[model samples]
Target chain A: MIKLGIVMDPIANINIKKDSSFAMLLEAQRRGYELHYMEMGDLYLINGEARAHTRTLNVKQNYEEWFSFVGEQDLPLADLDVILMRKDPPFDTEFIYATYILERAEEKGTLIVNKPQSLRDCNEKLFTAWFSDLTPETLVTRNKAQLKAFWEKHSDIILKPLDASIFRVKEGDPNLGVIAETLTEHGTRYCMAQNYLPAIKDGDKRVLVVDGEPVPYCLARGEPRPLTESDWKIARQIGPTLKEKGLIFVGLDIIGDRLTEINVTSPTCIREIEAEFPVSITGMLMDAIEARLQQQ
Target chain B: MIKLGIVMDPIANINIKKDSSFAMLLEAQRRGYELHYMEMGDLYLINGEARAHTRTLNVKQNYEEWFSFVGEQDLPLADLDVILMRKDPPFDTEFIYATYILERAEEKGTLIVNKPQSLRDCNEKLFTAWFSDLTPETLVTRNKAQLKAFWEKHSDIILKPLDASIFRVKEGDPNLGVIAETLTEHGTRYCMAQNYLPAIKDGDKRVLVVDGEPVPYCLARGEPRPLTESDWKIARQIGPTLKEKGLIFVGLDIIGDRLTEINVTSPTCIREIEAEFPVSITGMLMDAIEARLQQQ
Candidate 1:
């Protein structure tokens, strides 16, 4: 049996009806993979040996009682065929430390989804900068003067910190200076300012790509849409890059084909896509994972 | 002139008399290196380019008013020849994120002292496990039973968490079980346990290694010693290993030649070594750094 492990937040806290990690777990269970579960704090390294305090997890599609622990043990993470890092952010120091430990397992030949090093190297907001032509005009700075310049030029923009909620600035707002100062911490904190896309009123679309290929559908929080030819072009440009970076699965947040954010670390929307559409996103993901494992 | 940047904690809070970073700044100032300063929050990355909100720093050997900031600006960290990561811990998510930023600068040809990746990889207490023969009997586990078993075998042991303070356990302690439970949080947290060395009463020696070679002296808080041949052997064994791993400067904590901790993140005691001995620890460090830069 294929031994699969998932590193995620406390399972008790997850909203089983909507959690993408839960959807993946349910599918893995259905495919006869022996599932093991670990929380972020449970993963660690001792003498360069990557191990985790994990439990044999039996997941069910039932919403009321989704999972149960069969047994618990401390085991080397390398024992697994593949490990999915499904923890949600605040991706802080502990998260980074976990990646270092997980990387050790990767070195030992266990496939780690999204890849540990790429998870560290790719910041969701900053990764968007790599595809500048496909993104809104963006400025990343801690300088108040430069921030104001970007704001004046863009008129309406969105400011995002590396970690936290974003602030939207409408054109000629009275609070522009104060918002910039507060967000940038008076020129002490780096903030990413992007031209505010009015197209977002239609919703921020999440395009799921597996192994550098789109899964044939996109999900917006409101209504879904067919992938446009331009969207396909963007995917073709970004997909291979993500695959090359070892990001086997990704969610591209696009506002009308202008890439806004690249969610590599624990990208979601699998359940939402399935709920509204006929696509079995998790099934496709499992097939991709199984094919990769077979090749290895 | 050499441009040196330091990412550290707030200068106002550091005890100038004992801060090793301050001693490095003093030596850099004395040698005519243009010094740049940043607090932990000051370092950032934008579009894969590492930058910092930094100030040109001027330093004197005076105790009361030892340093002054000339001017502040946001600049690429790669502008500096070398950047020193001297921020003390809580080594949390923010700390790991900062290392990722520094690693980018490292890629762009800026030397980051002690190297950013190694800093993230090496946990002081856990890293000693890498040299098992040089260390006392050690166990790193979140397993309650394994911890109790190790404690029973060693009888007297010291327990350490990654960021928190250490706890010393004596044999037949009234609260041994409770202590283990609390420390391990009933097998939820990973903790390091080591055989207690009675030699600690003599003093914990801090051995400075630069460029894979030990300085002629080692510093003990209460006393000083010429390093023994055995100590030299331990240093020689571990020094090159550290260097190979890209750690340019390190402080190894030893209790009578049995390694206790490997401090990579801002190792202290340069000021103490200078205070007690004729050796210029920071000067030796500068020489090693300058040599590496010249070779590059």
Candidate 2:
């Protein structure tokens, strides 16, 4: 049987009304492929053999209450045709273990989407290390001497843990202490420090790509609110160019041509941008997925 | 105080003498640097901290025999400057864990010579994968289908496990049944199979490199024992060239230009090779150690 498995967090009722997982799940159901779902904790190691407790998931797209999934199916992970290791990560040891388990399955002939081992080997931030041209003025180190040297070079620098994706910064105020505290708590001595960019005050674009091809673009602009010291939450809030690109997947987060982040992890701009411009962004993403599957 | 550490199997004395660890330790003592010893089991992870319960070894030479050592002093791993994570392997989990322990020490500012992480990442057979140009015809896989396909193409193929340095291929009448049994017993879906090189029957050379620099050629040619019907024990005997090349670091292996195995975990050619060459090869290895330390 051609089985499509999605390894992710349990899809809640509220998420079905909005999230991208529901959109993908709904498509799998329509294709008549046997769909399976496996949670993070369900993965286990038995006498050097990697196994996961999965369940047959039957999903549907009904606007009011979009979908429901069935309960248990004990399966040897290698039996699946395609497994999507789509769990969001803080990228802890537990997450690394999950990637190892799936990679072992891949060795046994299971086609895991996005290649779990490669994803695990290359972190989103570390992946940027491969492309030195696309990064900001940055420093990565754990030693106090190295950090001090970096600070001496840049008056106002943004310090973030090597693993953290969320950026917390305010205009005219550098939060170096918060970064230090987080490092201390996590026993993380090394961090990636970059010079702050001010183009973010206007908006940032999120560019999504699938198999080296860019999709439709989305922009994140600043939300207008009373200026408070801790109130600056930089996310996709506004942008003008929405209907211009009819591509498959593109997330271009720009602060005046300087891209802040290329959000591959469910780049959000479809709802707000499509509402203003009227185009099916989800359809483009699904079309890309279909194209990839056909190539395989 | 400069510290030098040696890693080896505590039980290896049961099989071989005048090994790499003993030679390195003796040379280290002569140079006035403190010597430390650690076994595979001495390593552990406590509170996410990697550590080992090591002993400061006092080594001696010319004490009636070739394999002679004195007393030991117990110490914590954190206090060492340099650590050598050398361990004989089936390339099993224990060997991997030791690498992690030394790699952790490396993160904490200690210089682990030869880089434990690099050594750990590169299995003896698989390390050759990185430098494909300098190797013979090699195929790596666990799949039976792939193995069969490879065998059909190259009629006289040599099959070895990923970690098969100490293995003795029992006198063989062709390798079909042995290969089948090995595949079943190991559940070894992955293995390296190569075309047999008849030049290995004459002799093979073992070369060593230290800190990215190749040693001045300390080669060991194995004895040409007739290929028996029961088993072929390649690299069981060491050759004479070891006396001329006084290298602190050495690798001993043979199979034409094909290096069958690396002897990082206590390589020994002194007693066996010196008998034919009429010189003290063990003392020559120690002399190289003394010369290396003086330069530092």
Candidate 3:
């Protein structure tokens, strides 16, 4: 049996109906993989060896009693065939530290999903800047003057902070100053400002990419454009980039073919996409992981 | 003239007499290198290009007016020849994020001191486990049982926590249970237990190792044995290992020839050793940094 470990936040605290990690756990359990579970604190490294104080995790599809742990043991992370880093973010210091430990396990030949280094290297909002052609005009800065200039030029803009909700400013809003002050805290922190995409009213589309290939569907709140070669064209451009960065599973946020964000740190929406489409997104992800493991 | 940047804690708050970063800044100023200073918050990445909002730093040996900032501007980190990561630690999430930003600059060809990757990979206390023979008997675990057993075997042990002072446990002490509870917090966190070296009463020697070679002098509280070849031998064993790991400057904390900690994160004491010795430790560090810059 393949040994699979997941580093996540408290499973008990998750919404079983909506949680993507829960979906992953349910799917992996069905595939007969021996599941081990840990939180961020459970991971530690000594000398050069990565280990986790993990619990044998038993997960079920049932909502009421979804999971249980058998016993806790300190196991070498390399003992696992695959480890999934599914912790939701603030993506803070402890999270980054966890990646360093996981990176050590990767060195010892354990496969870490959504690879640790990429997770650190790629910021969800700013990473879109790498694909300037596909993204809206964005300015990343801590300068109030630069931010004001970007706002004046764009007129309608969106501001994204490192670990907060995105704020949208409509053209000629009276509260623009308040929003700017709140987001920037008077030029104390770096913020990403992008030209507001009116296309978002049509719904922000989440396109799932696994192993450098787009899973055949995208999710939006409404019925929209037919799946086009152009969508895949954009995917094809960015997929290889993401793959090269070692991101095996990613969720791309797009508004009218302009990529808005790259959610590499614990990308979600698997359940919503699965509910709407005939395709099994989770199954595709598992298949891709298995394929990668076989190659190893 | 080389453009140097330092990502550090606030300069206004540090002890000018003892701060190693301040000492380095003073020497860099003396050498006629242009210095730019930033705090952790000032570092950010824009579209995969790392940049910092930094102040042109001016430093002096005088404690009354040790440093001043000329102006602040946003500059790409790669504009500098070298950057020093001298931020003191709780080593929290923000610190890790700053390292990620610095690593990006390192990728863009600016050398980062003590190397960003090593800063993330090597923990001060736990990293000593790599040289098991050189370190005191150590047990790293979250298990209370294991901790108790180790304590029983060793009789006297030291508990290392992130920020708290080390807890020294003596055999059959009335306070053992209380100390154990405080350090482990009911087995919720990982704790390091090492046999307490009573020789620490003489001094905890701070040995400076730069680019795989030990400085001729080490700082201690009292006059101990003559600086021996064995001291350099220990340094030789670990120096190459440290250089291979990308640490250009490090502070190795030793107690009676047993390695206690590998301080890759902002190792201090340049001021202390330089005050006592005829040799300029800061000058040596600058020479090493300049040599590396010339090669680049």
Candidate 4:
């Protein structure tokens, strides 16, 4: 039996309708695999050995009784065949610390999904640096002048702090200084600005890439779009790096032909895409995990 | 001629006598190298290219006015030979974001001291995991029972939050529960607990490791101690990894033989160790930088 553990937020807090992690767990249960469930607090390390208080988990297709915990036990996390790190972001220090603990288990032999180090190394907005040729004009800074200058140059742009929140910046807007000040916390924080792509009206194309290959369909904030040539080009350009970094499951954000962001930390829309498409993302993900385990 | 950039806390706030970054600045000045000064807010990235609002800097040995800014200019950070990431810790999200910006420069051929990726990778306390075999028995967790049980076993333990602050835990402590609650934020944060070493009574040895070699002397909460076999072993064990990761200068904390911490981000104590021993810690650091530049 494939013994699998998933480190995520509380299962009880998930919406069975849209949660990709839930879809994966449900698929794992359907495959008759042994499933372990854990939240952030369940993971810990003793003398560099990663262990977790994992509860034996059961998932069903029924909405009323989707998931139940049978029992819980603490065990070395490396004992599992593979683990899926499905924790949602804010990606704060606690998450960073959790990654360090997971890395310990990773070094010992167990494959941590998306790789813990990669999770730390690749910030969704910043990871686009590797393929900048395929992205729009983007500037990330905390300086007032720099942010303002970028706004003037781009005229209409999307700006945000690296961690949270978003703002649309335009040249004629008088509140630009206040916006820059608050977003950058008076030049003590980092903010990102990207030239606004009006093609976003078409939809923010999110292509699901699993193990260096893109699913045939994508979510475009509408119905699933058959993956376009632009989307395919973006995916093909970024896929090898994702595979090389061991970032097995990821979402590549694109507007028209230019890349916008790389969502490696809990990228969603699996259910939305799977509903309209023939492909089973969770199934493909499971197949990748099993293939990785066999290769090891 | 060597051109170096240093990203640190404001130079105006530094103590000329105690600040290690100032000492390095002085040494680089003594050698007539071109220096660029920047604070955390000065670093930025535009379309994957790392640039900074860097100031041309000059330093003097006199305490009356140890440093001065000649002028300011904006440029791609890759123009510099090397940049020191000397920003002080609380190493929060702002710092993490700064590292992401610096990593862009690092990829474009600017060598960031303690390599930006390694800065994010190595936490002073959590990094001890790499050599946990030589450390005191340790447990890092958020669960109250695990924290309490670890305390119960090793009665005299040093319990601390992953970010900051410390507490000494013993079997008879009455406030254990509250301490756990406060430090771990009721199991939502991770705290590290390590068996307290009685050898700490003698001293907490602080060894300076530069470019994979230990300085001949060290600070042990007292006058410098000549290098011990234990200190050398710890240094030798961790040195290559530090060197390999481009973490050229690091400080290893030791209580007796076991490594307590690794300070890679802005590791200090240069003046103290230099004062007590017949060595130029700053000189050696500059020489290492010079040598690295030649190799490149």
**Cα RMSDs, all models:** 3.8, 13.9, 3.7, 1.3
Show the colliding residue pairs in model 3: A93-B93
* Candidate 3 per-residue C-alpha lDDT over B36-114 given as tens digits, one digit per residue, 9 for 90 to 100: 9998667766556788888998988786888888988989999999998888877764565567678778878998997
- Point out the worst 10-residue segment of candidate 2 chain B by lDDT: B229-238
Better of 2 and 3 by DockQ: 3
Candidate 4 positional error at B166, Å = 1.4
Kindly report the fnat of each predicted structure, to 2 decimals.
Answer: 0.15, 0.00, 0.20, 0.89
Per prediction, the TM-score for chain B is 0.96, 0.70, 0.94, 0.97
Off by over 4 Å in 2: A45-50, A61-64, A164-188, A221-254, A259-296, B1-296
Q: What is the lDDT of residue A31 in candidate 4?
A: 89
Writing each residue's lDDT as its tens digit, candidate 3 over A1-296 gives 88999988899889988899999988998899899999876776655578888999998877788899987898899999999998887766446656767887898899999888788668786566567778888776555666677788878888877554788877767876666677777765666788888878877787878978887777765442334665687888898888777899998887877888788878877787677678777898899889989987
**Model 1: runs farther than 4 Å from truth?**
A10-17, A40-48, A52-54, A64-74, A126-153, A171-192, A274-280, A287-296, B10-17, B41-48, B68-74, B129-150, B174-191, B274-280
User: Once model 2 is optimally superposed onto the true structure by TM-score, how far is the C-alpha of residue B120 displaced, in angstroms?
Assistant: 10
Q: Which is the leading candidate under lDDT? A: 4
TM-score of each: 0.85, 0.48, 0.85, 0.98
Question: What does candidate 4's lDDT look like per residue over B1-296, in tens digits?
Answer: 87899999888888988899999988888898899999888888888888888999999878788888898999999898899999998878888888888888877788778788888899988988878788899888888898888887878888888884788877678988999999988878988889989899989988988898888899998768888988888889899988988889999889899899889888888898888778999889988888887787
Residue-level lDDT tens digits of model 2 in B35-96 = 77766545543322455556656655544443433445444456677665556655553344
Candidate 1 chain A, run of 10 with poorest lDDT: A90-99
How many clashes show up in model 3?
1
